[PDB]
Design a protein around this ligand. Sequence first.
Ligand code: HEM
Ligand SMILES: *[C@@H]1O[C@H](CO)[C@@H](O[C@@H]2O[C@H](CO)[C@@H](O[C@@H]3O[C@H](CO)[C@@H](O)[C@H](O)[C@@H]3O)[C@H](O)[C@H]2NC(C)=O)[C@H](O)[C@H]1NC(C)=O
Ligand SMILES: *[C@@H]1O[C@H](CO)[C@@H](O[C@@H]2O[C@H](CO)[C@@H](O)[C@H](O)[C@H]2NC(C)=O)[C@H](O)[C@H]1NC(C)=O
Ligand SMILES: *[C@H]1O[C@H](CO)[C@@H](O)[C@H](O)[C@@H]1O[C@H]1O[C@H](CO)[C@@H](O)[C@H](O)[C@@H]1O
Ligand SMILES: *[C@@H]1O[C@H](CO)[C@@H](O)[C@H](O)[C@H]1NC(C)=O
Ligand SMILES: *[C@H]1O[C@H](CO)[C@@H](O)[C@H](O)[C@@H]1O
Ligand SMILES: *[C@H]1O[C@H](CO)[C@@H](O)[C@H](O)[C@@H]1O
Ligand SMILES: *[C@H]1O[C@H](CO)[C@@H](O)[C@H](O)[C@@H]1O
Ligand SMILES: *[C@H]1O[C@H](CO)[C@@H](O)[C@H](O)[C@@H]1O
Ligand SMILES: *[C@H]1O[C@H](CO)[C@@H](O)[C@H](O)[C@@H]1O
Ligand SMILES: *[C@H]1O[C@H](CO)[C@@H](O)[C@H](O)[C@@H]1O
Ligand SMILES: *[C@H]1O[C@H](CO)[C@@H](O)[C@H](O)[C@@H]1O
Ligand SMILES: *[C@H]1O[C@H](CO)[C@@H](O)[C@H](O)[C@@H]1O
Ligand SMILES: *[C@H]1O[C@H](CO)[C@@H](O)[C@H](O)[C@@H]1O
Ligand SMILES: *[C@H]1O[C@H](CO)[C@@H](O)[C@H](O)[C@@H]1O
Ligand SMILES: [Br-]
Ligand SMILES: [Br-]
Ligand SMILES: [Br-]
Ligand SMILES: [Mn+2]
Length: 299
Amino acid sequence: QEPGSGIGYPYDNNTLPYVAPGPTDSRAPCPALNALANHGYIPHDGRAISRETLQNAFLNHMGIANSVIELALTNAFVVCEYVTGSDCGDSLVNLTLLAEPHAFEHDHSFSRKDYKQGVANSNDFIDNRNFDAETFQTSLDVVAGKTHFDYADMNEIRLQRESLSNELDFPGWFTESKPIQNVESGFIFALVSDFNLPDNDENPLVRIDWWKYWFTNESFPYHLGWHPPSPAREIEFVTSASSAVLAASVTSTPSSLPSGAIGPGAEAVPLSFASTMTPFLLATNAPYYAQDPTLGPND
Ligand code: HEM
Ligand SMILES: *[C@@H]1O[C@H](CO)[C@@H](O[C@@H]2O[C@H](CO)[C@@H](O[C@@H]3O[C@H](CO)[C@@H](O)[C@H](O)[C@@H]3O)[C@H](O)[C@H]2NC(C)=O)[C@H](O)[C@H]1NC(C)=O
Ligand SMILES: *[C@@H]1O[C@H](CO)[C@@H](O[C@@H]2O[C@H](CO)[C@@H](O)[C@H](O)[C@H]2NC(C)=O)[C@H](O)[C@H]1NC(C)=O
Ligand SMILES: *[C@H]1O[C@H](CO)[C@@H](O)[C@H](O)[C@@H]1O[C@H]1O[C@H](CO)[C@@H](O)[C@H](O)[C@@H]1O
Ligand SMILES: *[C@@H]1O[C@H](CO)[C@@H](O)[C@H](O)[C@H]1NC(C)=O
Ligand SMILES: *[C@H]1O[C@H](CO)[C@@H](O)[C@H](O)[C@@H]1O
Ligand SMILES: *[C@H]1O[C@H](CO)[C@@H](O)[C@H](O)[C@@H]1O
Ligand SMILES: *[C@H]1O[C@H](CO)[C@@H](O)[C@H](O)[C@@H]1O
Ligand SMILES: *[C@H]1O[C@H](CO)[C@@H](O)[C@H](O)[C@@H]1O
Ligand SMILES: *[C@H]1O[C@H](CO)[C@@H](O)[C@H](O)[C@@H]1O
Ligand SMILES: *[C@H]1O[C@H](CO)[C@@H](O)[C@H](O)[C@@H]1O
Ligand SMILES: *[C@H]1O[C@H](CO)[C@@H](O)[C@H](O)[C@@H]1O
Ligand SMILES: *[C@H]1O[C@H](CO)[C@@H](O)[C@H](O)[C@@H]1O
Ligand SMILES: *[C@H]1O[C@H](CO)[C@@H](O)[C@H](O)[C@@H]1O
Ligand SMILES: *[C@H]1O[C@H](CO)[C@@H](O)[C@H](O)[C@@H]1O
Ligand SMILES: [Br-]
Ligand SMILES: [Br-]
Ligand SMILES: [Br-]
Ligand SMILES: [Mn+2]
C-alpha cells in the first residue's frame, strides 16, 4: 500500500503500493512472488532478482522467514540454469522461467492449469503459469459454504486437483508431485491461516477469504484484517503442515487418482537436470492481473 497509508502498521512499516503488471513484465506461477513483484518488493518487471532481495521481501513484507525459502531459492536457481543453459549466479533471469513444466512448476496446481491440460494434440501446450479462475474454483468448491478449512480439508483439495488433472491432462503428461505441492499447502497455512484464533500454531485454519484475495488479486488481504505473521513463519511450521495435510484422514475419495496418492509424501529435495536435457518451451502469455475489479494502489 502507499507508504503513508499505514495499512501494514505495525507489522510492515515500509509498504509500497500495488501496481498491475504491464504486458512486458515477467510474472511467475507463484502467487507469493507475483504479489511481491506487483508491490516492487522484488523488481516490478520480474527480472534480475537476487537471493537477498527475495529473502528481505518475504521476511519484511510477508512474515516469511529465510528458512522457509532456502530450498525454494536453491531450486529457483537450478531451474534458471536448466532453462537458460548457463549458471545464473545471483541474478534470477526472470520469474517466468519458473513455470518450466515438470521441474519446479508441477501438475495438479491449486489455481493454474497443467502444461498439457485438455490439449487435443500431444505437442500442444497451454498457459500453466497465470492464475486461472476456473481452476481455482475447483479448489474452492471442495470447501464451498465455509469460511475456514483445516488439514483434512486441504488434503481433500489436493486430491480433487490430482484427480481432475489426471483425467484432463493429455495421456502420458500427468506426473504427481506431492512433495512440491504439499510444501505449498504448508505455505498456504503459514501465510493465510487465521492467527486470530487461540490455537493457530497447533491447529491452523485457513481463512478462505484471505486465500481467495491473495490468489485472485496477487496482492495482500489487509482489507480483510490480514497482516504478515509475527513472528515470521519458519520452515518447521511449513513442513509440519505439509506432513499433517498428507497424514489427514480421507473421507471422500475421488476416482482417477495416481498410484500412492493417499498417504505420506517424500521430503522435498534439490532439483537436478541432465545437462543433455532440453527445457520445454515456456508459455508466452502476458502476465495476469485482476480485472473484476481492477485494483488500486492500496489493494
Ligand atoms: C524463492 C521463493 C519461492 C519460489 C522460487 C517459488 C516458486 C514457485 C513455483 C515455481 C510455483 C509453481 C508450482 C505449481 O503450482 O505448479 C509456486 C507455487 C506456489 N507458491 Fe511459490 N515460491 C516461493 C516462495 C513461496 C512462498 C514463501 C509462499 C507462501 C508463503 C509461496 C506460495 C505458493 C503457493 C501457495 C503455490 C501453489 C499455487 C497453485 O498451486 O496454484 N511461494 N511457487
Ligand atoms: C524469461 O526468460 C526465459 C529464459 O531466457 C525466456 O524464455 C526464452 O526466451 C527466448 C528469447 O525469446 C527464447 O528463444 C527463442 O526461441 C525461439 C523458439 O525456439 C526462436 O525462434 C528464437 O530464435 C529465440 O532463440 C527461448 O525459447 C525461451 N526459452 C524457453 C525455454 O521457452 C522468457 O521469454 C522470459 N520471459 C519474460 C516474460 O521475460
Ligand atoms: C480483490 O481486491 C479487491 C480490492 O480490495 C476486493 O474488492 C474489495 O473488497 C474489500 C474487502 O477486501 C471491500 O471493502 C471493497 O468493497 C471491495 N472493493 C471493490 C472495488 O469491490 C476484491 O474482493 C478482491 N477479490 C477477492 C477474491 O478477494
Ligand atoms: C505467447 O506469444 C507467442 C508469440 O510471441 C505465441 O506463439 C504464443 O501462442 C503466446 O501467445 C499468447 O500470448 C501473447 C502475449 O505475449 C498474446 O499476444 C497471444 O494472443 C496469446 O494469448
Ligand atoms: C513499526 O513501528 C513501530 C513504532 O516505531 C514499532 O513499535 C514496530 O516494532 C515496527 N514494526 C516493525 C516490524 O519493525
Ligand atoms: C511437505 O513436507 C513434508 C515433510 O517434509 C513432506 O512429507 C511432504 O511430501 C511435503 O513435501
Ligand atoms: C517438517 O519436516 C522437516 C523434514 O522434512 C523437518 O525438518 C521439520 O522440523 C518439520 O517437521
Ligand atoms: C508441526 O507444526 C504444525 C504447525 O505448527 C502443527 O499443526 C503440527 O501439529 C506439528 O506440530
Ligand atoms: C509429518 O508431521 C506431521 C505433523 O507433525 C505428522 O502428522 C505426520 O505423521 C508426519 O510425521
Ligand atoms: C470427510 O471429512 C473431511 C474432513 O474431515 C472432508 O474434507 C470431506 O469432504 C468429508 O466430509
Ligand atoms: C468427496 O469429496 C471429494 C473432494 O471434494 C470429491 O472428489 C468426491 O466426489 C466427494 O464429493
Ligand atoms: C476413499 O477411498 C480410499 C481407498 O479407496 C480410502 O483410502 C479413503 O480413506 C476413502 O475412504
Ligand atoms: C471412483 O473411484 C473411487 C475409488 O477409487 C471411488 O471412491 C469413487 O466413488 C468412484 O467410484
Ligand atoms: C543432479 O542429478 C541429475 C540426474 O537427474 C544430473 O543429471 C545432474 O547433473 C545433477 O548431478
Ligand atoms: C483499475 O482500473 C480501473 C479503471 O477503470 C479503476 O476502476 C480501478 O480503480 C483500478 O485502478
Ligand atoms: Br528476461
Ligand atoms: Br470453522
Ligand atoms: Br511422494
Ligand atoms: Mn503447476
